[PDB]
Amino acid sequence: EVQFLRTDDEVVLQCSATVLKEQLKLCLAAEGFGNRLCFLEPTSNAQNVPPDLAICCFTLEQSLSVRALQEMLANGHRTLLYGHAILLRHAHSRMYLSCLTTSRSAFDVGLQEDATGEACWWTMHPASKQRSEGEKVRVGDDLILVSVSSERYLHLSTLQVDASFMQTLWNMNPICSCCEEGYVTGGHVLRLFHGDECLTISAADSDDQRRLVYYEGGAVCTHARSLWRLEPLRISWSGSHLRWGQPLRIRHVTTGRYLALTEDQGLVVVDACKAHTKATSFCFRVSKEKLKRDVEGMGPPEIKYGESLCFVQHVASGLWLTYAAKKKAILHQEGHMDDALFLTRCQQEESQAAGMIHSTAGLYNQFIKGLDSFSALPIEAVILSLQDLIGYFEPPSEELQHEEKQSKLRSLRNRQSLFQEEGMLSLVLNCIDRLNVYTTAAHFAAESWKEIVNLLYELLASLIRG
Incomplete structure (x- = not known):
């Protein structure tokens, strides 16, 4: 089976490089607020250290022909065809990918507030004789990206990115696509509720040191400290429908740290560098009773925001996310009878x-x-x-x-x-x-x-x- 890219899909832009004699896949990244300049985020070491790939997400806002572009400038999800100009919105900052008039050492590539200019558009071309102009861009096709503004190829300098005259082959990897309404998918920011209570860490400047996780009620459910982003152990199709028992990391948004079982402190939040799979991999279970090869695409819808009640389990240990009896969260052998949580989208x-x-x-x-x-x-x-x-x-x-x-x-x-x-x-x-x-x-x-x-x-x- 093969998939095509449609407008309103979410994609990472990925390139590869042999580093230390080892091939490394990196994705196009940027911040927006604070910095407009694009950089590269390595995704190769994901099993040992999770990439900050919210910064790597791009929504395919538009795909037009040269004729359709020229007409629109003077003034239903479409499939990406070669020789088309595309508009890429940074999912995080809502800013558009564009080549910039500045240069640092070929232009620099980064973000701009509006999609107004020609700077923010890019035509995609075959990197091989395998594909023709006008043919559907396939998922996994090596492709070339020239800037409508500078007529220059998006390329990896050698590691950073610029609009050079030297080419680089890129991969557009699907993060997500049209999804079933109301279901949880990866990449989503949410709250995990227990009955007013939600899962949260302490407030800023606490003796907690923000390493411990709690169940808390009241104002917290409206504060940022109770927000978590769910991340699968996938790079491609990480924004697919979440499945029961599917291993995923649970990142705290403001803090950036990852929910983890730890040998010394038990259930804590943990720094990205220390977030190896065994420690940070969790899943949602229908029940606590004792116990699937992953698909390509959005997949089956299984978990529903608000309606689904899920038990959280640390994968490696089989321990249950539970409370101690504001009460402290722990991972426990048996857990409690009312451990089931529900998920609410931010x-x-x-x-x-x-x-x-x-x-x-x-x-x-x-x-x-x-x-x-x-x-x-x-x-x-x-x-x-x-x-x-x-x-x-x-x-x-x-x-x-x-x-x-x-x-x-x-x-x-x-x-x-x-x-x-x-x-x-x-x-x-x-x-x-x-x-x-x-x-x-x-x-x-x-x-x-x-x-x-x-x-x-x-x-x-x-x-x-x-």
Whole structure:
């Protein structure tokens, strides 16, 4: 059986390289908020360390002919045909893949806010005499991608990506496609509920050190700390319908860590580097009674948001996710009778906010550590991140209509809360305090220190403004 790519499918763009004499598959990645520049994410070492592949997801928003493109610029899911121009939306940041007027050392390739220009479109061509112009792009076909804007091939420099004149063969791998409505698929951000209670880790700056998992009720069910993203041990078709007993990792979104059984502490959350399969592989079980070769495609729908009750089991151990009797989660031999959980899907707005908090927090801890050493600096990214977060929290125009503004106001106040609860006020203050140890702009040595500090404060007010 063979599958074609249709518009509205989700895909990773994958290339290969022999590194240390060993072949390594890497996927096209980017951040969006904080950084627009594309980079490469290795997926070869997935069994030992999970790739951050939310950053690697691209939605095939459009596929047009040269004639259809030229016409649309002046002014039902389609199948991808060779010689077509495509529009790729970064699933994470909602930004489009495009080749940029800048160059760093051939152009640079990254993301742009709108799909307005010709920069964000790419025509796909056969990498072989095996395929013709106008023929359906098959899943697994080695292909070439030229930029409509620069007439240049997307390629891996040698590791990073650029719009060079030297070609590289790419693989478009399906993440997902049209799915059965209401069913859980991989890549989804969700909450795991127990009856008001949901599965969660502690709040920012806790003695917990954010390593332990709990069952908690109340406000948590509306906070980012209770969000988890489900990840299968697949690279291709990881966004297929989840199946009972199918092994998957459970990633905490804001923290980035992975739910794991550990030899020393039992059930904890664990850093990506330490998330080997045996430790971090879980599944959903219909029951606790004692006990399938994977398909290609969306597969059978088995788990339904809200209606399905699932017992969580650590695969390697067969232990049951359960509570101790806010109560602490543990993995246990027998578990409890009421261990069954149900899954509730997180909505886009609340979800990307949690994704932003994750990357922002990582970027700023990067900023913190370097200054600790002197007791590089990601300045371009930091001031970009800052300026982006400020636009994010920018109050709606006073000139906008009142009825819609009140709703837009609730959105802002919600975003702020999500950020505040994850200790972002503290984070920003932690940076402000670090920089103000230095007593001057020229005392620094450094050029944009005045702006980097200046912007941190501007965000602070934006995080507080009612």
